[PDB]
Amino acid sequence: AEKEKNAAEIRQQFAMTAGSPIIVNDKLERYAEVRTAFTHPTSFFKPNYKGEVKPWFLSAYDEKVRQIENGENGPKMKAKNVGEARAGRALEAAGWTLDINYGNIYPNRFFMLWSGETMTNTQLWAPVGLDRRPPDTTDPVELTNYVKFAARMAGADLVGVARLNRNWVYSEAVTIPADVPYEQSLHKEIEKPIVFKDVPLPIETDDELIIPNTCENVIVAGIAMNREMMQTAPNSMACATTAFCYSRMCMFDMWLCQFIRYMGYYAIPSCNGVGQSVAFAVEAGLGQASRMGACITPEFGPNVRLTKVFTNMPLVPDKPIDFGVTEFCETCKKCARECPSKAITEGPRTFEGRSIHNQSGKLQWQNDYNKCLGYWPESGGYCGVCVAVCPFTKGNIWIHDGVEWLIDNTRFLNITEVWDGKINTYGLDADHFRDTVSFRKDRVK
Amino acid sequence: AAEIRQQFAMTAGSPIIVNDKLERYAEVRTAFTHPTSFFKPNYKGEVKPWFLSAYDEKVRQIENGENGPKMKAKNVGEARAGRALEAAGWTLDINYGNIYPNRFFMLWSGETMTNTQLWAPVGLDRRPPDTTDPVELTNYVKFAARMAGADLVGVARLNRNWVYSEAVTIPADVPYEQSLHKEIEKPIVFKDVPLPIETDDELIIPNTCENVIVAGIAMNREMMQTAPNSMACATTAFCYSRMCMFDMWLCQFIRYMGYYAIPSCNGVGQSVAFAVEAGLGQASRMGACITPEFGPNVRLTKVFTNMPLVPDKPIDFGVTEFCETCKKCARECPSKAITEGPRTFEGRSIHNQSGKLQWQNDYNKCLGYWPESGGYCGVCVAVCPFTKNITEVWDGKINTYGLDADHFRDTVSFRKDRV
Ligand SMILES: Oc1c(Br)cc(Br)cc1Br
Ligand SMILES: Oc1c(Br)cc(Br)cc1Br
Ligand code: SF4
Ligand code: SF4
Ligand code: SF4
Ligand code: SF4
């Protein structure tokens, strides 16, 4: 008989011994956030469909408008009618409600405050003194169970803990001056160093973002996207599950940081800022790095968003996991073949970056992310075809042979229906939601 | 569960029975806000705003290693953690309930929001609707509501009887730090205007505001069963922040479809009445809307809109007749707030709206138990048949947002059940 899927068993079977799994060499240096394709001047500008050169997201806007007027849900993809085209873009736009300028990357601005002191919730609760009272728990074992329970309340589908590896913290962040209002933010972005110093609390000066040397740990959350919507990549409904999950990321960071602060510790939110989420997720055991560059998880494949919170709270690091992703990516190459921009390499991993957008000195598949971003104005969305076609995104990959779990090798050989089809709360799927149930035994050992 | 809800559909028409005495209810009359109920003593005998006295009890319990009134925790650390989780849950909620209309998160226009400004070049909020068919719109908006975190969603025509006659709010330029000390009353009126608008004198809802969308936000069963202790407070608090995100997400979606949308959370009007008229559940002895999926262990929020929609049918699965003989909430209520008598049209005090047939409860007695216990009680929700220690909760089953995979299939949705 078919053995019922056991996600906790799978993670236990593939757990590794302690140690960062990312292989590095001597040319590794911390990476300035401005180098990402979203922000770097060499990649930031893209043509629109009339050949006008604009910030990439404005060119993409032009294409969304064109598609709605032409009754399309994506590039050369006709919608049922204009109203359906409109509805997909309204859903996408609404999804971003709790996210600043596509990713919340500015540290200690807007939702990403490094201290709780000025938040309305902190002010309302001030008479209890939870953020001023010294911790009543210092045991990392109990703290890990408490904070993971809170993380699940706060919307994480996956949660893991690692020691903080500063290699993946950006050398300089992209941010805005503290006196700049929102409406000018996109015109006034600057860089600011992230430094580690002997100070009691995270603090920002005119010159630096200062993380305490006591900031020992990073908590990484996975925020699951919706399978049916992502499978419409590169069309509008894939954009909408992406967007909603960014607002879920923001809520998660704020909720969890407040919990940690009210336990007597400090906490730094990040969403897409501060450091490289994929590396932290790999070191925290959520999954493995992949050819496409994302963290592939046993539960969701790469079809999951990541955020993270940095803290001095004592915690028990999780073990990394190796369920064979590297070996499957070595022979699969479906994302590379299906990529509309040919951004993903079909070659071997190297330590040598393809361009300014890659951090050299770590063994990975090196992809051309200027090519990827170039397809976003062309398609009017955030693509996601590589996530959509990856066999690990399928809900159906795990089989049990009577002794142990294994990956089914056979897996590697329209939008109207989405709007009319299955949905559940937050786009989660009840046919798989059991996979993320959690008891103390799987939160801390 | 889609089977059950169709089986128990009523014919159209509001199931709340009213008489000629009914009048719209001023929000200040709630026990949370009214001057006769607002001040309560703490355990030292000092009279304070009720929530400040409740704070004093939370501090006393943490110092004493307790998770609730005369409920010892495993240790002080566990006591601290439950209150830290509770406090954190409220992060996206202003002053317990987001009730001030058109302030903070509850803006009646999207024009100033950061998301609207970022998306302004696309012009979704200025473009006329491309869809006016109420059938397609009902399908679209319910799909969006599920993306936005509703576990249940229903649509009703807007019954103005349940809209507060006057809201509790603050002047628009008052900073948060002074909000609690500068609350005022402000009329909510309906006029022939194009868009929801606020003047110095009035909150103005357009006469075109035809519909209300009601969302159910499920609480966690294991945590609510710890009522009146701290983990029941935590699931309450997290769901309030889920309510706020739902309102903003859904209002933005409706605006980007070419319509207007008014968020509300605990403000603007009476959620239980809207939820009953929208078919989420039935009114009960304790006063809550009892749902088939969650019983009363579910929070409510609602959004008002001129978007054309198909109203859902009210549901009757026997709650009134069961509450007639049950009385379990009334017997377990630590404050004797819930009546054991029959339903009437006459409120027991200023806190009830007279003129509608309901079980009349003494809500000042309920609120009085909150500073005593240091929480939001919830014992009535916990003991209700329709709903079915703290160390075991922290060490036990949890899942994303506190939802339960053993029951999550009950809220799966296809177009057939959306419209
Ligand atoms: O990660 C993303 C960012 Br940052 C911006 C936009 Br637009 C889309 C995605 Br996906
Ligand atoms: O509904 C509630 C409000 Br409004 C305030 C507090 Br405190 C607790 C609850 Br439950
Ligand atoms: S599609 Fe294949 S090669 Fe690409 S990330 Fe997925 S498994 Fe790896
Ligand atoms: S998002 Fe699209 S363009 Fe970018 S790497 Fe993936 S498949 Fe290629
Ligand atoms: S919340 Fe508690 S005190 Fe209030 S009615 Fe329910 S059982 Fe009674
Ligand atoms: S406990 Fe019994 S009487 Fe009270 S609301 Fe529930 S079913 Fe009704």
Numbering used by the authors:
A (entry chain A): 1 to 413, 431 to 462
B (entry chain B): 7 to 394, 431 to 461
Quote the study's own text.
Several monoaromatic halogenated compounds up to the size of 2,4,6-TBP were visualized in the active site pocket. The hydroxyl group of 2,4,6-TBP is located 4.7 Å away from the cobalt and 2.4 Å from the Tyr246-OH. The bromine substituent at C2 is fully enclosed, while the bromine at C6 points towards the substrate channel and the bromine at C4 towards the upper cavity, where it is restrained in its position by Tyr102 and Tyr382. The hydrogen at C3 points at the Tyr382 phenyl group. Hence, binding of the planar, triangular 2,4,6-TBP to PceA with a bromine substituent towards Co is likely to be impossible and would place the other bromine substituents in conflict with the aromatic ring of Tyr382 or into the substrate channel between Tyr102 and Phe38, a position too narrow to accommodate a bromine. The low Km value for 2,4,6-TBP supports the reliability of the analysed enzyme–substrate complex, since it indicates a high affinity for the substrate without any steric hindrance in substituent positioning. We show that in PceA phenolic substrates are excluded from direct interaction with [CoII] and most likely [CoI] by a tight packing of aromatic side chains that places the substrate at an angle of 40° against the surface normal vector of the corrin ring, where it is kept at a distance of 4.7 Å from the cobalt.
However, only a dozen of the corresponding gene products were biochemically characterized including the tetrachloroethene RDase (PceA) of the epsilonproteobacterium Sulfurospirillum multivorans. PceA was described to mediate the reductive dehalogenation of chlorinated and brominated ethenes or propenes. The crystal structure of PceA showed the norpseudo-B12 non-covalently bound in its ‘base-off’ conformation deeply inside the protein.
